[PDB]
Amino acid sequence: QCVPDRGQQYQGRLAVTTHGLPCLAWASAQAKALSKHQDFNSAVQLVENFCRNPDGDEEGVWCYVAGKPGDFGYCDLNYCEEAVEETSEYQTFFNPATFGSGEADCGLRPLFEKKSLEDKTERELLESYIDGRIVEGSDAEIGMSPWQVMLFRKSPQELLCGASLISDRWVLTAAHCLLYPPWDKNFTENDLLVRIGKHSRTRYERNIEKISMLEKIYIHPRYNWRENLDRDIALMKLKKPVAFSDYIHPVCLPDRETAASLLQAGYKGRVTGWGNLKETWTANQPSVLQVVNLPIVERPVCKDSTRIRITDNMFCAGYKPDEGKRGDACEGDSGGPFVMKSPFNNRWYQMGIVSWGEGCDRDGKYGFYTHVFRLKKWIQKVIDQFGE
Numbered sequence: 001q002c003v004p005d006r007g008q009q010y011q012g013r014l015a016v017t018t019h020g021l022p023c024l025a026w027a028s029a030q031a032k033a034l035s036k037h038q039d040f041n042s043a044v045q046l047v048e049n050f051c052r053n054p055d056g057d058e059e060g061v062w063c064y065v066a067g068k069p070g071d072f073g074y075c076d077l078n079y080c081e082e083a084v085e086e087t088s089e090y091q092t093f094f095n096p097a098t099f100g101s102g103e104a105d106c107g108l109r110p111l112f113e114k115k116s117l118e119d120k121t122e123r124e125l126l127e128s129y130i131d132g133r134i135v136e137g138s139d140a141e142i143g144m145s146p147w148q149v150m151l152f153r154k155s156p157q158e159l160l161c162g163a164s165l166i167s168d169r170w171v172l173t174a175a176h177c178l179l180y181p182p183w184d185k186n187f188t189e190n191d192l193l194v195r196i197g198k199h200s201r202t203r204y205e206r207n208i209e210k211i212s213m214l215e216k217i218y219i220h221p222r223y224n225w226r227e228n229l230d231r232d233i234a235l236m237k238l239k240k241p242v243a244f245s246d247y248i249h250p251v252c253l254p255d256r257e258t259a260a261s262l263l264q265a266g267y268k269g270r271v272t273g274w275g276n277l278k279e280t281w282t283a284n285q286p287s288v289l290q291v292v293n294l295p296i297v298e299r300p301v302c303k304d305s306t307r308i309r310i311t312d313n314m315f316c317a318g319y320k321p322d323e324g325k326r327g328d329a330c331e332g333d334s335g336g337p338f339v340m341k342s343p344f345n346n347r348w349y350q351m352g353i354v355s356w357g358e359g360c361d362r363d364g365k366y367g368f369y370t371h372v373f374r375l376k377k378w379i380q381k382v383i384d385q386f387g388e
């Protein structure tokens with residue numbers, strides 16, 4: 001019954017997006033005059049105004065919608081549930097002229113991989129939890145997470161969220177950091193700033209940290225806070241590209257194949273932050289950047305740990321709580337990075353964005369993270385729309 005291949009074989013008549021936007025006809029005005037620069041697969045049939053997946057979009061079928069030239073949304077199909085959790089060789093997916101620079105060299109930290117030095121806990125990521133001792137969260141080493149980004153409210157100045165650097169110019173965070181009506185949150189570009197290269201939360205880091213304005217915010221078109229933070233994803237463009245350093249460097253983004261390889265080889269991923277998730281919940285506390293390694297949870301155990309429906313776009317991490325052992329629920333910075341290291345190409349990849357399940361009033365077992373592995377075609381279409 002379920003729709004396979006992310007809807008690439010689909011031949012039905014669904015012609016509205018998840019958010020009620022009527023699809024435009026594939027042959028239409030700005031669907032033929034400003035929508036042919038993109039390379040489509042001819043085996044897919046672009047019929048009338050029906051949702052289709054002609055570009056191998058891991059997210060699924062989509063269609064053009066009214067708005068600016070190239071505007072589009074995704075459609076609601078019942079995709080088959082997919083268990084993603086099943087020199088330096090890397091090749092660049094995005095156009096550097098719209099992505100900015102940084103992709104070719106992503107996930108190789110100047111102070112670690114580039115000097116053939118291992119950070120203090122990375123070997124832990126590839127080791128089965130022997131039961132026994134756990135390596136607890138501690139202060140990060142200098143340069144350990146040079147893709148770490150802080151999102152601030154401009155006025156009053158206040159740390160709002162974490163985020164992550166994916167190029168010199170683009171940053172990923174959770175949509176609920178920008179738009180969350182339950183907490184009366186509706187931030188536009190001019191309400192915010194970001195600081196990059198930071199280690200200390202409270203000390204100005206002369207010659208190291210960088211501040212930046214945001215030029216543009218793209219909330220994911222599937223974002224729906226109503227149904228358990230569905231597609232809790234946002235992409236933000238820096239008004240001025242940030243200069244790379246020993247302290248500022250982008251993380252890599254994985255496709256489905258790379259995600260599979262990361263979860264097949266690793267036992268654990270890594271969460272870095274200033275405990276902002278725990279703090280903002282209490283609003284709606286470490287002064288130095290923290291790092292903790294957390295085991296990936298088996299999907300059935302994740303499904304059984306919570307009341308809500310856990311979709312295949314979401315995963316749990318943390319140690320299982322016991323009579324003498326608390327878990328790692330609500331770890332990290334809201335919208336912050338959950339990363340994994342590839343033992344195959346030595347590079348770091350973001351695997352999730354810190355989210356929540358029922359939230360910190362009833363999440364007590366594991367933390368919840370939104371998968372990033374489906375995002376590449378979305379990011380591609382967004383950056384090509386924005387232009388250079």
Ligand SMILES: *[C@@H]1O[C@H](CO)[C@@H](O)[C@H](O)[C@H]1NC(C)=O
Nearest residue numbers: 179180181185186187188189
């Ligand atoms: C937030 O307010 C903006 C004004 O900047 C307005 O355009 C918009 O309706 C609000 N955003 C949402 C998602 O409601």
